[PDB]
Write a protein that binds this ligand. Structure first.
Ligand code: GIV
Ligand code: GLC
Length: 400
């Protein structure tokens, strides 16, 4: 598999990966996160952990378990860290700590390297043996709720190091190494692989979307952070000027996200009257269906209020789609304003750029080529893999 990436990134990146992998042959590595079920962290680890194994690394991946209440508490911590807002009962921290204890009993932690992904398992460091512990933060912690952050920083300060997706998430109030490594797409995964036009046509038609007219696509959960209501608004404002245009909102549920409906109803409401709005809800691991819709799209949106990175952006740029992205978090390192897409602070701004891109075919096409090249140079899985191997070599040598 790893030799297949030379086509994209060249022989020098691949040789470096082998050289780093050689130095790490005798370390065991554990990844712990909140879901294998699909999207985001699971989607990365489903490609990344097997690549680590192909390079001869003893890499394992274990998923924590919880009650509906546990995921209620962790979803509230997530929103509180990203928005700086929310009322957090004292009971939330007790539920959290109790489910750390339960998982610690059921997950062996005797590894040379332990990667803990995101806040849900951060408390497992209480039960650490003598290996190197790395907190992999996927979310925006730039301006967090002081009580939720104060609590979490209690655990984070005990790690050997920490990975954030962009430098802007690095914390002034931590002394441990903070390394900025963005997530990545696998260009050979079912999400990103080339499809024949037949496959694209099949899937777009199946869902009752007109292939012969322009499609505006957002791939995202029905989550307030992705602002589905604001996407509909953007589309409604643009639709006056581009009457042939259709909106497809392609959502899926998340194992650690119980707050996934009512927003759907609000979205349905904001959609009422417009027949060219398609609010789709697909199973997780509908990767080829997402692929098809991204290739079918004329313009892609990721109009997030908050976003750690937004893999949906690089997925669209790779397929040569311009992206209108929320001016926030890791969207800003993928969407280079006027080059790979446009950054927006409101639905009204999004509408202006929707009409611009739909009226300017050569500009759209150029932006798409610049998007793919920007992802080829920055956001492919071999770069993330190479930088992870370097972080492990760096931090294990500091630990020992
Ligand atoms: O640790 C939280 C995780 O964050 C990712 O961005 C997201 O794709 C997953 O659905 C999950 O919520
Ligand atoms: O890092 C992978 C994903 O993790 C989570 C974040 O909310 C999302 O922004 C990111 O793309």
């Amino acid at each position: 598999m790893i030799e297949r990436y030379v086509e994209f990134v060249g022989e020098h990146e691949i040789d470096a990966i082998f050289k780093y992998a050689e130095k790490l042959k005798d370390l065991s590595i554990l990844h712990v996160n909140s879901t294998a079920a699909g999207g985001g962290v699971a989607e990365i680890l489903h490609r990344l952990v097997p690549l680590m194994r192909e390079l001869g690394l003893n890499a394992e991946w274990k998923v924590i378990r919880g009650s509906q209440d546990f995921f209620t508490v962790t979803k509230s911590f997530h929103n509180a860290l990203q928005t700086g807002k929310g009322e957090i009962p004292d009971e939330y921290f007790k539920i959290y700590d109790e489910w750390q204890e339960i998982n610690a009993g059921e997950i062996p932690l005797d590894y040379d390297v332990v990667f803990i992904h995101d806040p849900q398992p951060a408390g497992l460091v209480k039960y650490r043996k003598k290996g190197t512990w790395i907190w992999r933060c996927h979310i925006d912690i730039s301006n967090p709720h002081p009580k939720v952050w104060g609590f979490l920083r209690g655990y984070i300060s005990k790690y050997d190091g920490m990975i954030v997706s962009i430098p802007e998430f690095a914390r002034d109030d931590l002394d441990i190494p903070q390394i900025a490594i963005p997530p990545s797409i696998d260009p050979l995964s079912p999400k990103n692989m080339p499809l024949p036009q037949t496959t694209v046509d099949r899937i777009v038609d199946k869902f009752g979307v007109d292939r012969e007219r322009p499609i505006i696509l957002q791939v995202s959960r029905y989550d307030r952070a992705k602002d589905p209501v604001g996407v509909i608004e953007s589309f409604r404002l643009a639709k006056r000027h581009v009457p042939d245009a259709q909106l497809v909102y392609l959502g899926s549920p998340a194992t650690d996200d119980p707050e996934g409906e009512v927003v759907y109803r609000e979205t349905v409401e904001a959609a009422r009257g417009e027949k060219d709005v398609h609010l789709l809800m697909l199973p997780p691991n509908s990767h080829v269906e997402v692929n098809a819709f991204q290739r079918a799209a004329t313009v892609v949106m990721q109009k997030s209020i908050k976003e750690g990175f937004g893999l949906t952006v690089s997925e669209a740029l790779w397929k040569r789609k311009p992206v209108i992205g929320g001016n926030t978090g890791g969207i800003r390192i993928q969407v280079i304003n006027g080059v790979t897409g446009f950054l927006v602070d409101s639905p009204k701004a999004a509408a202006y750029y929707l009409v611009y891109l739909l009226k300017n075919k050569k500009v759209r096409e150029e932006m798409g080529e610049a998007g793919r090249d920007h992802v080829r140079r920055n956001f492919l899985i071999t770069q993330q893999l190479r930088r992870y191997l370097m972080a492990i070599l760096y931090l294990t040598k500091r630990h020992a």
